[PDB]
Amino acid sequence: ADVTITVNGKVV
Amino acid sequence: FACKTANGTAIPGSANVYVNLAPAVNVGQNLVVDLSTQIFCHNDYPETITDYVTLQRGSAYGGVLSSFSGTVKYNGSSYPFPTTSETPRVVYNSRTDKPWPVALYLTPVSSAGGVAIKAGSLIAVLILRQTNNYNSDDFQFVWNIYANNDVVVPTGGCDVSARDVTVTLPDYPGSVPIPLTVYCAKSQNLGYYLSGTTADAGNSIFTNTASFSPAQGVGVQLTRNGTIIPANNTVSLGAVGTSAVSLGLTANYARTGGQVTAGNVQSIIGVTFVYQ
């Protein structure tokens, strides 16, 4: 890949 | 005759010269490093001696860049890189520091690819020949060029605002825009596709691969203007030029089936550009 997107989230 | 870096540190066989790089796409060739802001030389006896410096054949990239061909701009003129013949001379006829007018370029071979270069690593092995108009002194020496800062050299006609993007979703549920733009040195018919571990058969939901205390029942889904972008499906941006164009991406949560339980959510999603 040319760009790496790290998507962080949370379920509370 | 003596040379120094932008730091003022004197350049000493062979020498290790550490330089700062600001790589970038240009039209038809990408800049790796402009050495003219990094290396400066002078003449110690200018009233009676004129110094000459050339770039010898065999000068080439090193490290991760040794696989790429390109060009060297030497004193205002362009030459193939690695060099196959000796360049014309630069003259040094003053005690005042003058740049070494050298810029190293890379021939674009991708759409928007990049090669990471870390600080401390070798980027080029340059061979110089030094002569004068005074005697028969004729000597060659080697300058090993090292990166002084972490950069990514663009290998394509287009480049991105960031190579690594970290976005944080609001607590479930919620969305966040993904900041990411692309531009090209000259106009290109440009598209992109997503890749990564997906959870559904439709390849529309990226799996929650959080390592520590992961949630259940949810994954990450990206949209563009309200439209789901599945993995491995080319999004067309039309013609992209020097003005930055957003990829238009937004991150969302999406249910992958079953009970939704508390925990962390993480998905690592690649973006790959293509010419159309």
Alpha-carbon gap: A9 to the closest alpha carbon of chain B (Å):
5
CA–CA gap between residue B185 and residue B159 (Å, rounded): 8
Alpha-carbon gap: A8 to the closest alpha carbon of chain B (Å):
5
CB-based burial of residue B138 (10 Å sphere; 0-12 exposed, 13-18 middle, 19+ buried)?
exposed
Alpha-carbon gap: A10 to the closest alpha carbon of chain B (Å):
5
Sign of CA dihedral B142, B89, B75, B36: positive
Cα–Cα nearest to B148, from B39, B272, B227: B39
Place of tokens 């990094």: B38
Q: What is the DSSP letter of B62?
A: -
Domains, chain B: 1-154 (2.60.40.1090), 155-276 (2.60.40.1090)
DSSP string computed for B200-232: STTS-SB----SSSB-BSEEEEEEETTEE--TT
Beta-strand relationship, B181-184 and B39-42: unpaired
DSSP string computed for B115-179: EEE-TT-EEEEEEEEEEESSS---EEEEEEEEESS-EEEE-BSEEES-SEEEEEPPSSS--EE--
> Which residues from B are below 8 Å from A10, CB to CB?
169, 171-172, 215, 263-265
CA B249 to chain centre: 23
Three-class secondary structure of residue B35 per DSSP: helix
Q: What is the DSSP letter of A8?
A: E
First to last CA, chain A: 32
The tokens describing B115, both together, are 């090669």
For B114, B171, B191, B266, the CA distances from A12, given in Å and listed in that order, are 38, 7, 36, 14
The tokens describing B73, both together, are 């701009």
> Strand pairing partners for B89?
none
> Which residues from A are below 8 Å from B218, CB to CB?
9, 11
In sequence order, the 6+-apart residues with CB closer than 8 A to the CB of B8 are none
- Sheet with B2-5: list strands edge to edge: B10-11, B2-5, B39-42, B98-99
CA–CA gap between residue B267 and residue A5 (Å, rounded): 8
CA–CA gap between residue B238 and residue B188 (Å, rounded): 8
> Which residues from A are below 8 Å from B268, CB to CB?
4-7
The resolution, in Å, is 2.0
CA–CA gap between residue B182 and residue B272 (Å, rounded): 11
- Residue in chain A nearest B181 by alpha carbon: A3
